[PDB]
Design a protein around this ligand. Structure first.
Ligand SMILES: [Mg+2]
Ligand SMILES: [Mg+2]
Ligand SMILES: [Mg+2]
Ligand SMILES: [Mg+2]
Lengths: 219, 217
């Protein structure tokens, strides 16, 4: 039952430093090494470094000593520190470990790190309700528009997660240093507007949590 | 520092068919003091972290389906899926852990399936956005295949191309279809300058375009 979870800042300005904490569970850091791997927006995997049980470290030579890894065995925490970040350091940063000496068996969810001087901006959440009436025994498509936020990511759910099937959340598009995305949900006409349908949008970087009830509109 | 190259970069296949992928290393990954090939295969589905499929080049990780088999030695390795499942949609990375840790560029596995017509939905701007001075008109084109699709925005009959932003989802893990969102962003004043707003979609599944419209009325 090994688990790793990364906690990072989400946004780092160019030439500034990156700090991420990997909190592990299910094993002692005394006995196992922890590795760091990042995935840039265009995908692929790049190993960054590791810290052994005894506290020694190995790093990727390409990082030019900008990378330093430490840990606190007693708190099950591994500390990633990288200096003078540039745009091409934008990536999802994973911490990973293997119960054998290798290969890596357990990966965290990773934390997205965007390198930009742009400012953090909260999203605007708008309901997308149909313009006309729904036919009998039809399935109706609703949506939410999430506009003008930065940086990634946002999370969207429907009815606090109780509405999981029939959902499409589209990838965000970047324009003028602002992200926009949308999410659709398709449900039977006998369930809406009879029952509540609400989209739940979270932008952790802005500490924003918004619920937008989808209500019918005046045809 | 060993370099790992994979081929093909991407690959499409129907469900139930067999596929083979290739991973080549610039230096041998066979350790003489172990007679083990330090070679691993990972699967990464959209929105998920890598998942170890194979290690020692041919040892299958516990819990992995038996359709996944890896083979090869020295500098030439192969991953086979005896019968591709719809859920096998993913990027497959090979990996060496003999001398430091390096990864291949990945092979993207995509799923071929039967054509599927889209469901088109058009949504007028919300009152919340209009109060802010903006007027985004949104069109959802859901659960179609193949990915190629043409969307045309018409205002009072005339076409508009400025302010259109399109976004496609990944292939669905269960039915392997595509969805697309098209957002036409105007200001409130521009929006209130016209009346008829139309999202017109054209897809291989039909010669007649799908027309969804609303009137600001
Ligand atoms: Mg109803
Ligand atoms: Mg090197
Ligand atoms: Mg299946
Ligand atoms: Mg459809």
């Amino acid at each position: 039952q090994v688990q790793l979870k990364e906690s990072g800042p989400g946004l780092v300005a160019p030439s500034q430093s990156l700090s991420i904490t990997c909190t592990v569970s299910g094993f002692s850091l005394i006995g196992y090494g922890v590795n760091w791997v990042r995935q840039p927006p265009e995908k692929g995997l790049e190993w960054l470094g590791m810290i052994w049980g005894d506290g020694s470290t190995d790093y990727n030579s390409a990082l030019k000593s900008r990378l330093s890894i430490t840990k606190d065995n007693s708190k099950s925490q591994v500390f990633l520190k990288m200096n003078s970040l540039q745009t091409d350091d934008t990536a999802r940063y994973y911490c990973a470990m293997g119960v054998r000496p290798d290969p890596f068996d357990y990966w965290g969810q990773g934390t997205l790190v965007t390198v930009s001087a742009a400012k953090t901006t909260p999203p605007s959440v708008y309901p997308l309700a149909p313009g006309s009436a729904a036919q009998t025994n039809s399935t109706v498509t609703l949506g939410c528009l999430v506009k003008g936020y930065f940086p990634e990511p946002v999370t969207v759910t429907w009815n606090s997660g109780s509405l999981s099937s029939g959902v499409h959340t589209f990838p965000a598009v970047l324009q003028s240093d602002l992200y926009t995305l949308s999410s659709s949900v398709t449900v039977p006409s006998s369930t809406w507007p009879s029952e509540t349908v609400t989209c739940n949008v979270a932008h952790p970087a802005s500490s924003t949590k918004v619920d937008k009830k989808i209500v019918p509109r005046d045809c | 520092n060993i370099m790992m190259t994979q081929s093909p970069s991407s690959l499409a296949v129907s469900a139930g068919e067999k596929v083979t992928m290739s991973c080549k290393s610039s230096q041998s990954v066979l350790y003489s003091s172990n007679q083990k090939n330090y070679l691993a295969w990972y699967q990464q589905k959209p929105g998920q972290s890598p998942k170890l499929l194979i290690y020692w080049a041919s040892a299958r990780e516990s819990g992995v389906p038996d359709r996944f088999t890896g083979s090869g030695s020295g500098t030439d390795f192969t991953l086979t899926i005896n019968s591709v499942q719809t859920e096998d949609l993913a990027v497959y990375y090979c990996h060496q852990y003999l001398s430091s840790y390096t990864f291949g560029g990945g092979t993207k596995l995509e799923i071929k399936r039967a054509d599927a017509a889209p469901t088109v939905s058009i949504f007028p701007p919300s009152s919340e956005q209009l109060t802010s001075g903006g007027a985004s008109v949104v069109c959802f084109l859901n659960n179609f295949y193949p990915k190629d699709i043409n969307v045309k925005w018409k205002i009072d009959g005339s076409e508009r191309q400025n302010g259109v932003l399109n976004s496609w989802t990944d292939q669905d893990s269960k039915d392997s279809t595509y969805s697309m969102s098209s957002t036409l962003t105007l200001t409130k004043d521009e929006y209130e300058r016209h009346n008829s707003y139309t999202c017109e979609a054209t897809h291989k599944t039909s010669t007649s375009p799908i027309v969804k419209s609303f009137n600001r009325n």
